[PDB]
Scaffold this active site. Structure first.
Site, PDB file in Angstrom:
ATOM      1  N   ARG C 390      -2.531  -4.564  -1.568  1.00 36.67           N
ATOM      2  CA  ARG C 390      -2.389  -5.281  -0.311  1.00 36.67           C
ATOM      3  C   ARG C 390      -2.602  -4.410   0.918  1.00 36.67           C
ATOM      4  NH1 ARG C 390       1.349  -8.276  -1.452  1.00 36.67           N
ATOM      5  NH2 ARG C 390       1.605  -7.426  -3.569  1.00 36.67           N
ATOM      6  N   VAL C 391      -2.894  -3.125   0.753  1.00 32.43           N
ATOM      7  CA  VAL C 391      -3.319  -2.309   1.880  1.00 32.43           C
ATOM      8  C   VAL C 391      -4.846  -2.217   1.952  1.00 32.43           C
ATOM      9  CG1 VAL C 391      -3.369  -0.037   0.784  1.00 32.43           C
ATOM     10  CG2 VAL C 391      -2.644  -0.225   3.158  1.00 32.43           C
TER      11      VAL C 391
END
Ligand SMILES: Nc1ncnc2c1ncn2[C@@H]1O[C@H](COP(=O)(O)OP(=O)(O)OP(=O)(O)O)[C@@H](O)[C@H]1O
Ligand SMILES: Nc1ncnc2c1ncn2[C@@H]1O[C@H](COP(=O)(O)OP(=O)(O)OP(=O)(O)O)[C@@H](O)[C@H]1O
Ligand SMILES: [Mg+2]
Ligand SMILES: [Mg+2]
Lengths: 52, 483, 523
Positions: C390-391
């Protein structure tokens, strides 16, 4: 003195209806443990209980 | 009077241990010095276990507990009508104290075998899906069960609103006085609901016993019993009562909280072993009394929210084995616009047909039969395989009866304007009217038929042979839409 | 019982003294005659009240802090975990068989410390910091607490620099930033350690090519493993050269359960030396699901109230206060970073289990490793449909980000129609092209163990598959067709892809030309 037998029925004095207890256990310090055949709402911790 | 004191030993997890109070009764209402009430639950050898009707934050170790001398009571009487009370009968609507009222116990044994009689007189809810298919008599317990947002309250609300309209047209001796018990709901939606009962005029006959989601769990546990004692006033004095315990699902969760904080051993879905007796003790008090006890009646509508249509849950099946009938509200019918989303195949009324309108008893017999085939046909003709043109006839007839049982919210219908509308659709008068027009079409049927037909049917209670001769005539003369 | 009747007994009420004046003259001879039948009373010391299963209840120790190292008279260390009204419940860092009832406990006055610094680098310590590689004590090192509070909101900056694993499935699909917590989750024997090993080995290959501040210093924490498994990892890291930058904190399976609980925190304090000094750290907590079983053992034996799967109530707080220490610090705190890789072993893929649910909530994405993809030939068995980073929305190599976005779509369309058209008999002319390209893209991403690839060389192998150049090798040659592209292409495009960071349009045209004179083994 002279605890009732297990399964013997007891009568509570001065209740709103006829409250019949039935002795389930012998708790150990001259105490029996009973199951009430009616409601216990309105029971006081000094009420005399007679053995049938 | 000599005041018996007691110190608090220890408080927290919603229950105080109280030293002293040597002559306190089991189930006694005790009062703490902060004003908050409590119920003496467990009389022990050395303390009293007190469940606290409110926030336990205001109680400290060493607070004084006074006994009130009596078992847990609420004020019952005619001064409760119109008033929004909490789970202990104390008014929260800001309209002063309950005058013209008298305290009575919330925990009363339900009437026995010899104190009941058979449920005979009908209770009209004003919902034509209910009053034709699942008919409800006075003294019955009818479970409104369904998922989240399936019109569970809509059915309970229109029943209460309909009793106001019926109370203006009947003698005083047969007038239903409603109680709405709101357990575990949002204080918002109770305030929308008191406004709705006020602007309709239904709060003239309604008590509102609210134990919201911010209230303590013993207050939500008690409010069904507080509400039932207020409605048992009308049952015991010869009058008639309606009670709605909205979300008995939420009473049992409040009672599961008290049991697990009392360190009691849990059972199915961590519920106590006496969670059956919780609702069994409550719903047996909705009785129809004998003529020697007054002839009064209390009708219960317990509400149970299921999760994914699971009627085989623990609390759901507990109440199905307590109540007489069942109004099962389905979520697939609800999102298809069919509202009230009655599961006709599962919704039943045990007492039921012995206590319905004799006009509707001879009209809705062929309604639940033809809706049975429409359920039977459209369970097998889902595929669009082939057509018999009689199965496609009952597919077009059953689609007309389904729209005939649709109903709008907050507009209950009298039973005479209901049974004419079912007579208009089962006797073929609403044939060839398109299924997107029957909401408008029996609005035309009820409005264009002479009002005297509804008055003859209301007073006779039955479609006499002089009336169905005349009512077929007055349905021939009806400007149906589209022709 | 009551109090108001018992508080009035502090006042004297005797009013007669035939006992108080007698036995006060007769107490001290009777007590002194069993002086050798006495032990001296402990106040600031401790006496072992009862011991068993690595838990010693200790009378006394009036001044111990919660979480403090205590020492028994056997020399075994302890940790005062729950201080109660009558005793101290300590957990024993070692064998409690040398601890007897009546033994003396001495507080050290120290909350638990570990040696952190430049001298711990290259050594194999136990779960408490003491070296077990057998080459003397740690020199050029200093002590630091293992329960450091994690950096706040305001001491962090955005995770933008890519940390390269060297695995094509990881570096393209689920790319790791420099201060990120990425879970490596999956069943047993699916290649969770081998992902974490290759990320460490690739740091050694990168540390000799970067200017001394982009260097990553790895920490492998082995919790609850065999001692022979850690002996293999030491041999693998020494024969590579990766243990110039690697620490190994090893609390194995025969070690005490407080040591296996404490080994992730001990390795993170060694890893936080690099984060706090402007360098970059990388920490792998292998079997974080074996730390939690060790913490469950200490909790149930200390009689803490159990929760679901009998874990304590603070087992989320256990892993969150460990994994939030992996941060990317702001430039006023040096700009250093620490990136974690916790390893959770599931049971038949059940990631709804209690510890796997907790660590999925904490970390910034999972690497899933299915065991059906493992035996299907896909090794590393990275399930693309369930593994998230999710980064990674612009936190990777810009040259790989040119082509990994198309690979993320062209593999995604393949996953719906893969289990659709298991047959290859009767196929549309549109869905079969997805099944031929998606099977070309799957075979390109798999790679062998202990050979991590530079990022500039897996960029061109995805570019060789995202573009054309590989739509003619069958499925069985793309393993050989990719290393054909690595061998045959002029390796000076790697020097200007890696230095620039993206595929410039001049390099883009030479990349098409260099990928045409290759001799693909499809023949
Ligand atoms: N007969 C009806 N016709 C149209 N809308 C209806 C009807 N009955 C209910 N509704 C609407 O359906 C929605 C849900 O109904 P209702 O509030 O009774 O649900 P519920 O079962 O009480 O759900 P909750 O769990 O929120 O209490 C509301 O917007 C309500 O106005
Ligand atoms: N990319 C790969 N290519 C080929 N073989 C591999 C690859 N990754 C792992 N393996 C093999 O699969 C086996 C399991 O790998 P590994 O030990 O890394 O998994 P693990 O998840 O740590 O299992 P466990 O947790 O039970 O130790 C190893 O013996 C390794 O040789
Ligand atoms: Mg509702
Ligand atoms: Mg492993």
């Amino acid at each position: 003195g002279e605890l009732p037998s297990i399964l013997s029925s007891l009568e509570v004095e001065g209740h709103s209806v006829r409250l019949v207890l039935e002795v389930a256990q012998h708790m150990g310090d001259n105490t029996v443990r009973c199951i009430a055949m009616d409601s216990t709402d309105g029971l006081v911790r000094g009420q005399k209980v007679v053995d049938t | 009077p000599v005041i018996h004191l007691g110190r608090v030993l220890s408080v927290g997890d919603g229950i105080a241990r109280v030293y002293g109070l040597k002559s306190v009764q089991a189930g006694e209402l005790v009062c703490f010095d902060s004003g908050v009430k409590g119920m003496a639950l467990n009389l022990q050898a050395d303390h009293v276990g007190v469940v606290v009707f409110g926030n336990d934050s205001v109680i400290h170790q060493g607070d004084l507990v006074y006994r009130t001398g009596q078992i847990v009571n609420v004020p019952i009487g005619p001064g409760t009508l119109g008033r929004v009370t909490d789970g202990l009968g104390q008014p929260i609507d800001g309209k002063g104290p309950l005058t013209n009222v008298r305290s009575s116990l919330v925990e009363v044994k339900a009437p026995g075998i010899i104190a009941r009689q058979s449920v005979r007189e009908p209770l009209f809810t004003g919902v034509k899906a209910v009053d034709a298919l699942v008919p409800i008599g006075r003294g019955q317990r009818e479970l409104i069960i369904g998922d989240r947002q399936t019109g569970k309250t809509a059915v309970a609300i229109d029943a209460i609103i309909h009793q106001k309209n019926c109370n203006e047209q009947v003698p005083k001796a047969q007038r239903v006085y409603c109680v709405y018990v709101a357990v575990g709901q949002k204080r918002s939606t109770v305030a929308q609901l008191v406004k709705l009962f006020t602007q309709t005029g239904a709060m003239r006959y309604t008590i509102m016993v609210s134990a919201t989601a911010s209230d303590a769990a013993p207050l939500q546990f008690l409010a069904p019993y507080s509400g039932c004692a207020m409605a048992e006033y009308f049952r015991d004095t010869g009058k008639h009562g309606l009670i709605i315990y909205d979300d008995l699902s939420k009473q049992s969760v409040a009672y599961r909280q008290m049991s697990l904080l009392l360190r009691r051993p849990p059972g199915r879905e961590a519920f106590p072993g006496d969670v059956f007796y919780l609702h069994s003790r409550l719903l047996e008090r909705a009785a129809k009394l004998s003529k020697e006890l007054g002839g009064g009646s209390l009708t219960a509508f317990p509400v149970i929210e299921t999760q994914a249509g699971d009627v085989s849950a623990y609390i759901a099946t507990n109440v199905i084995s307590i109540t007489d009938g069942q109004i099962f509200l389905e979520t697939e019918l609800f999102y298809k616009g069919i509202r009230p989303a009655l599961n006709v195949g599962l919704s039943v009324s045990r007492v039921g047909s012995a206590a319905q309108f004799p006009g509707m008893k001879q009209v809705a017999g062929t309604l639940k039969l033809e809706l049975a085939q429409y359920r039977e046909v459209a369970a097998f003709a889902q595929f669009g395989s082939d057509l018999d043109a009689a199965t496609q006839y009952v597919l077009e007839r059953g689609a007309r009866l389904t729209e005939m049982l649709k109903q709008k919210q907050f507009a209950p219908i009298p039973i005479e304007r209901q049974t004419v509308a079912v007579y208009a659709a089962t006797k073929g008068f609403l044939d060839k009217v398109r299924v997107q027009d029957i909401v408008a079409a029996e609005e035309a049927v009820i409005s264009q038929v002479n009002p005297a037909v509804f008055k003859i049917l209301k007073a006779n209670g039955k479609i006499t042979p002089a009336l169905d001769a005349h009512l077929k005539a007055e349905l021939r003369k009806v400007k149906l839409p589209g022709a």
